[PDB]
Amino acid sequence: MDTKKFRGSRTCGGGTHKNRRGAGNRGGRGKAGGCKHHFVRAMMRGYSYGKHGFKRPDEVSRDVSIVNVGELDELASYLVEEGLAEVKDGAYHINLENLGIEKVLGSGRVTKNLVVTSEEFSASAREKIENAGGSCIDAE
Amino acid sequence: ATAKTIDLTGKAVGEVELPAVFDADYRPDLIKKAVLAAQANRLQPYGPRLYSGMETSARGWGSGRGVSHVPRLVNSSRAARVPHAKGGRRAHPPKPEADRSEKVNTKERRYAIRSAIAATTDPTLVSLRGHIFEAELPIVAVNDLESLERTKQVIEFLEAAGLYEDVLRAKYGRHIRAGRGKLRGRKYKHKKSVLIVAGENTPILKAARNLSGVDVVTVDSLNAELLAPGTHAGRLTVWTESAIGKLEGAFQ
Amino acid sequence: MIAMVSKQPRKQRKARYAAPLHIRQKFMGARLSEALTKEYGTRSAAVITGDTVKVMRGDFKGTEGKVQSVSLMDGTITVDGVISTKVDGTEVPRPLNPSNVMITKLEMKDGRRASSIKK
RNA sequence: UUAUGCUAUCAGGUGGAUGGCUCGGCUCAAGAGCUUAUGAAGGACGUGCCAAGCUGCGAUAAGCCCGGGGUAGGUG
RNA sequence: CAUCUCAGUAGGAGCGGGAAAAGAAAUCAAUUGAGAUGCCGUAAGUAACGGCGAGUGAAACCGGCACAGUUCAAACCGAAUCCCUUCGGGGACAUGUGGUGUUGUAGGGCUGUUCAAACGUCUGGCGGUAAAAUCGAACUUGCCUGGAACGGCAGACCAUAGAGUGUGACAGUCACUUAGAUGUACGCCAAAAGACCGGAACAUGUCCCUGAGUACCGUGCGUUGGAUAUCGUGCGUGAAUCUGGGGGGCACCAACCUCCAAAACUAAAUACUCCUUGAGACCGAUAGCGAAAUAGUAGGGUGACCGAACGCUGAAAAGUACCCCGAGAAGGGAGGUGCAAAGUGCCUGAAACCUGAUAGUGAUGGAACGAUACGGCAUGAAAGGAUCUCUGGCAUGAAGGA
RNA sequence: GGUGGCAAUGGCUAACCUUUUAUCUGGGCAGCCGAAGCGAAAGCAACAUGUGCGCAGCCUUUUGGCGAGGCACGACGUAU
């Protein structure tokens, strides 16, 4: 706190000089007082007691990266500019495994012709891709 | 943009186009931040000894003895170990593990450096900042300035370029400091005259070295202290053609 | 010989105070007259008993005389003519400092003196 | 000439604050890093012309011999 | 508060060097890869543990610093080997000295062919590092003040040297230094160049060899994030050997991937500060180490052990001659030294406290020691006033108003 | 919180190297946060504007109109 603000105040913003003794003016040390006298604060902070669910090992689980069709469509010109994509006979041939994306979602609009190869496709993503005349290949 | 180039005789022998670093707006707060960060990073840890004032086995006498409740020596009545007792420890002293280094992002640090470099173009900032000069800012010199090897030649050039009165001002402004700093190594208070910039290491960094106030550096050694001593831009400086070449995209 | 890494006053005064007694011979240095410097090539020299000095600073500016004694530990020399009087009246030598004198006549009796002055 | 006293200032005593100075302390960095039965570190006693303490030294006792550096004084 | 935490902390016993420990996969991965160890960053307050409370708490992948691999036992040969020495000789050794050999998409020996010699050890000292140390520019110029110029006013120079200290007051040019160069015994390092043991492939197989109370397992306890899935070790039980054995976070079966334990050594990157050097938005004598060191001292305790205070004359001792008082080597007076008593624990020299003097008051008098207004007495030089202080006249005069 | 740099083609680097003595200049994409959520888990995967009221501001006959941000709906992803 601002020490110079309190030169000549005695109590230094604490009230009586009987406050600020030690751990008993805080109710215990740490998150102490779980549900006897700090129960309401315990519930509001996000420290409620309980155990709920299980965990799978991290060896087997994976966290897929995603990209929506709108995002993939809008930045296609920049992708071919960087040499990532390819523009043979007009339709963009864009491969998602060189970027680092394992699944294509479907939020947004698609207007350009896209030939997208990847591992996974939501149903709506495939519907939107092929309603614009494009094609999707399950990359293996 | 364009600026007159003057030889060692003081005659304009060309007109060189400046790079885009010199064309930027003045920003005092960024320069402030950069200079303060570097000066904070120079510092050096200090503090008392590990167990100072506490190597003791004092015990209190308790109540009933007619005296206070402070710890005292085992074979006497002299208080010890507490901050208000003579010879006792100090409450909240400095600590050697305190880390006082500051951080500045590279983009804003480069931006402050560019802002400080562009400030030397303005005659007003240079003039009101303390210096004395009779030249057309900015001062640009032909590349043979890196060939000078005797201090007398550098003095001749400075006299012919109207920048020697600042050197004399720095020489005669050297004066003894006041306070406890004299006993610790900082005996004088110096003044800042002129900064000479060269593209590459040459004998000029050894000739214009003893002149009072003059600091000579290469283009790859510019920071914010050199250009804003005390967080005030407007430092007299000299450049060369090679130095101008080095600054096409130097800090962008 | 103590390089620029000795810019702290504490270190310099330690070096000058607790010096080996063969280094305190160097602190007995004094300027040479014009002829001496242009015939030996050293801008200065050391003061030794038996040579004529010319006082340059203090109460005796311009008085000449021989050096009557030198003390290494004190760092002071004694000169002819320069004296102080007691209360009862007794002329006493007054110590000086060799950096306030000028050597006009060297005393060559060692033989090693010439080599000692230079190189 | 109102004594014993009260208040304020001045001169002096006692006392050792403040200021100025500081061969000391502390912290960080760079180096360097084992020794002793061929008797170590540490201790007791002795050793000086006048010498009690500390420092050095050991009945050859603030010390002896040789090589180099240094040059006119030395005797912590 | 008992499991938990404090914490493998404080403390103890043993061993030990300039470093130590570790270290060349019976490894980590996941479908397919990597390729000894240590230390730093991140993963991450995540997985995991837990009166599932408080709390405790990793590793692998990945990025860096620094890089280095090898030696035995056995299969084959059977004294072909080692060490001491008086150089005569003596000891070790068939219960095995020495040669070959050292590994996994197996290796080696036996049998046959080929290519020939990589890493390493020794001599060598070209050349570097290398003690005290040596050299190192340019003013001690004129007038003023002063006790004394490094200061003020004028003038003259140096700089690869304007870091700093000393000197009768502020010093690039007075001294030591600095920048930049030379010199060095004993030692250490090391390049050319010579000598020394020798290594790398291929073909053939009812052929021979490859680390035991060990690996694993039951059971108890400690420890761990280690959860039926960490490590240790008390007791008990206990294998195989290439057509083999181990691992892939509960046990078993199958497929697939990966390795070869129970013998040994090994530089560098790292940790620390008795000690040497450097630096400091550090302290400046009740501070900073307990100690500006006759300081672990004086002193205190039977003992384990606890533990202070004390810095400073002046430029130069020039450290008070001679005379009077006094019993005086006390001390005082007069008189000197010094710019100045600064007169010896002597720079400056505050307050409390004590002695004297000056102003006000005072032996009929009532108290938080003062604030405000009016008077007496004393002072009012500087730094405060001069249409200012005092006394009156005139003009305008708000609220109020006889 | 106050003040700043950069800005979905996002922001910042850590250890370390260049240090020429601790500064400093230039590298360093490992990694962290943001960019997609829901669910114990397997798993699945959304509006790059469809409607209205309307402040500031602008236009205007000074009464109305357009109306970023704001508020209220509608539609959609997932769990039950």
Ligand SMILES: [Mg+2]
């Ligand atoms: Mg202390």
Ligand SMILES: [Mg+2]
């Ligand atoms: Mg031992």
Ligand SMILES: [Mg+2]
């Ligand atoms: Mg090992």
Ligand SMILES: [Mg+2]
């Ligand atoms: Mg623990």
Ligand SMILES: [Mg+2]
């Ligand atoms: Mg110098």
Ligand SMILES: [Mg+2]
């Ligand atoms: Mg002390």
